[PDB]
Amino acid sequence: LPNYYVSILEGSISPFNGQLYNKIALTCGMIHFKEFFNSEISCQGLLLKLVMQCALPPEFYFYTKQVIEFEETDIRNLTLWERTDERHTGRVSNHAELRVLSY
Amino acid sequence: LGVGVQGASLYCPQENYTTKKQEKPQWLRPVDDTLAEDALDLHIVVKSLLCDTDAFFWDPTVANRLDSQYIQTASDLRNYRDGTEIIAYASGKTGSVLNLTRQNTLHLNRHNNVTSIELHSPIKSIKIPGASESIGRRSNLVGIITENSFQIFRIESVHSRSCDVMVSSSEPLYFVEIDDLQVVDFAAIIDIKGNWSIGRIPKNFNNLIDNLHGTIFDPEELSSWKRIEWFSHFQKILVFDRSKMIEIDFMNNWQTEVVQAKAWSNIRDYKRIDDKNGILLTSREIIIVGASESNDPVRRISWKHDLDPDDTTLRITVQKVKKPDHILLVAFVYSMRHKRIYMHVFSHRKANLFQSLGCSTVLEIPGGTPTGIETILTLDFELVVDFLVKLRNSSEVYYYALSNTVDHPEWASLFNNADEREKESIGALVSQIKLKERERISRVQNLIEHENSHDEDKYLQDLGYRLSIATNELLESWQKTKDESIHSKLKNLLENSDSFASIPEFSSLLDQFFQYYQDQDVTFIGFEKLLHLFLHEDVPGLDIFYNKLLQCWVLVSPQAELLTKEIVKDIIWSLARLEKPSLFEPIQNEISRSLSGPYQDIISSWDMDD
DNA sequence: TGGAGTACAAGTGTGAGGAAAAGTAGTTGGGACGAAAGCAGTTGAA
DNA sequence: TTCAACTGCTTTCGCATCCCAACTACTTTTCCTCACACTTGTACTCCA
């Protein structure tokens, strides 16, 4: 294999600055994740993970579930976001797991 | 006088077993390596306050913003007094306002009055020359360096009845040539970017350059860091860039290049140790304590230590420790990029027997990086030593003693709007949840009121019935739509999975629901072989999964139970993907895609090889 | 009780950057068993 | 009638200048990941 064909193949540097999230969206623009897979984040697990990170009183688990209900389109079923129109990044930061990081 | 020298140079480097032996056959450790022998030396900070007030590069011309040393004024000559300690630091807005005694630790005095002499130029260096013991007295005059001029201050009759230091000043000479000067030292003797001259200090403040000057100007050194020091009282000077040290004696016309540091290192800092023989140089890659020679006071290049860190912004300060048998020279290098010090211990005896002991490192405050570190002279085996630091990006100065024996406002400036009509309009939501939670602590409390009832055994017999026929409703679409050639929700029922009050029963009930579907188009993913991802251990069950959280959330919750119950009642309904078909459905979707791609992607798609 | 100016963000083209393991750039090392005899036609000068 | 060089012969078998290489450099082969300048409305009041 050629050297630039294998320097891409051997992982040197880790995915950084949202390089992983862009490659999710670039893949979902190539093949559509909708109408065959469920773009559904188990956000109950993610908050329970984030409760178990910093040992908080678990009422903030029940609060944050209510908080996302206040501001979310189709309350559950969090949006995995394909992109094919632009090569730009989504400045709204429409990654659903990245959204819960603000919530 | 030990043996292993070059004459030109002299090494005791980093743990490489130094290069001499006399072989003194005297049964008294018959060897005199430059490496010495003792026990350890651990250092402990004594953290205390003293006083208060594009980014990918850094300015070399800015040097310090403070100073601290014992000064003996003009009226202490005739009277009995000997030595007063001062500290003069820049202040203000752009670093433009330059402004005392020791009880047991150095602290600001009683009347604690800042003597704010005012300037109109950025402060870029604040230093005294020091003193001499051949002159017998101490200097009472200090000079500072700014962008617009060069200034000299003269400290006259420090007061003891009022703790107020009245200060006098000389003429601030502006620039005849428009070139930013760098370093002052006296032992207006200054170094401009590329050339130097000798300045004359007057006796009369009630109302310059001499006729001799020199230059070191290099067309291929690029930086703006120079430095000057007088060497060994002969009125020899030492001039620096980042590439060579030139020795110049203006008594005659005599100029010698001594250090040439272009090839693998660079000159970084140069402190003149109050010892009028020994003086310490910080190169890159090596620490040099090159002293003065008794035959010709030119340079006794003494035992130097190979320091390890590679950096572009290293400084040094040194403190002598005078013992009656020998003289120590602890050397403290510090950087502007991180938060560490690095030390080394030297010793000196009568026969120019410079030695070396070892190295250690300690840390600093987490907010900022150090930018100015100075040792208090302390008026002059359990080594004690004390000094002050100053960190960059904070205008505080603390005091430290060493004995032998993270909040950012940027996260604060992201919340907290000043909108009082929007204050409770935001704040209603924190009071809205005061309602919604108390219902949930009380409604499942009504399920706490009941304990394995037949009335709720009926409620769970009704549960699976609308899970069986709902599956039998969700199965019968996929068989007819199976010829798609190009999973589900399990939240279809919104009547139940809210008020069921047993974890071991519903775990069995779904296992009771698992056993029912022996048929095709229906498979599952087992929870107990997958529920361990939160506890990060071996969790083989759903019933012991509660038993881990049962001991876990005891203290931090009022009554601690149904909240812990409801989340365990949530997660199995949070992974509500139990609607896989049989094996047939993705396997028939494997074969369709390779037909659609060409015969070039046939050989490209082969799993399971070795 | 409509219009004149105008910053905040939704939204659209231009090249510029990043990395590696392959190859190629100048010096120095190094490759190479023979100091035999009486004798004769030509040939020295007398 | 002689001096001085040209002269073939001692045994009897078998033994016996051109090329290469070294190490460290610098470079090319390309493929992958995003930004930087432009623009219309909308928003907050602006002067009528």
CA–CA separation, A65 and A42 (whole Å): 11
- Closest to B22 in 3D by CA, of B351, B460, B250: B351
Q: Does residue B217 contact residue B228 with C-beta atoms inside 8 Å? A: no
Only one residue has tokens 């009055």, namely B113
B241 CA to D22 C1' in angstroms comes to 39
Q: Do A38 and B440 touch (CB under 8 A)?
A: no
Which member of B488, B566, B574 has the closest CB to residue A42?
B574
Neighbours of B216 (CB within 10 A): 20
Neighbours of B145 (CB within 10 A): 24
Helix (H, G, I), strand (E, B) or coil at B191: strand
Which chain B residue has its CA at the smallest distance from A67's CA?
B429
- Closest to B343 in 3D by CA, of B319, B324, B365: B319
Q: Which residues pair with B314 in a beta bridge?
A: B335
Q: What is the DSSP letter of B312?
A: S
**Tokens at A36, concatenated:** 């065959």
Using an 8 Å CB-CB cutoff, list chain B residues near A38.
487-489, 577
Q: Do A58 and B563 touch (CB under 8 A)?
A: yes
DSSP B530-580: TGGGTTTS----SHHHHHHHHTTSSTTSSS-SHHHHHHHHHHHHHS----B
Which residue pairs, CB below 8 angstroms and at least 24 apart, start in A27-36?
A: A28/A80, A28/A81, A28/A82, A28/A83, A29/A82, A29/A83, A29/A84, A30/A84, A32/A82, A33/A80, A33/A82, A34/A82
CA–CA separation, B402 and B384 (whole Å): 6
- Closest to A62 in 3D by CA, of B501, B564, B502: B564
Buried b (16+ CB within 10 A) or exposed e, B74-92: eebeeeeeeebbbbbbbbe
Q: What is the DSSP letter of B201?
A: P
Helix (H, G, I), strand (E, B) or coil at B409: helix
Neighbours of A62 (CB within 10 A): 20
Q: Does residue B106 contact residue B85 with C-beta atoms inside 8 Å? A: yes
Q: Does residue B242 contact residue B198 with C-beta atoms inside 8 Å? A: no
What pairing do the DSSP bridges indicate for beta strands B384-388 and B397-403?
antiparallel
CA–CA separation, B207 and B221 (whole Å): 41
* B374-375 sheet: strands from edge to edge: B48-51, B397-403, B384-388, B374-375
Strand D and A90 CB separated by under 7 Å: no
B238 CA to D22 C1' in angstroms comes to 45
Tell whether B137 lies on the interface with A, counting CB pairs under 8 A: no
CA–CA separation, B2 and B355 (whole Å): 10
The residue among B498, B567, B572 with the most chain A CBs within 10 A of its CB, best to mutate, is B567
CA–CA separation, B469 and B473 (whole Å): 6
Name residues 7-36 of chain A with a Cβ under 7 Å from nucleic strand C. Answer: 7, 10, 12-13
Q: Which residues pair with B357 in a beta bridge?
A: none
Using an 8 Å CB-CB cutoff, list chain B residues near A35.
none
Spatial CB neighbours of B248, under 8 Å, sequence gap ≥ 6: B214, B236, B237, B238, B239, B254, B255, B256
Q: Give residues after which chain B gaps, C-N over 2.5 angstroms.
A: 53, 99, 187, 207, 380, 405, 486
Neighbours of B321 (CB within 10 A): 17
Only one residue has tokens 């001029």, namely B149
CA–CA separation, B211 and A40 (whole Å): 84
Nominal resolution (angstroms): 2.7
Which member of B440, B489, B571 has the closest CB to residue A44?
B571
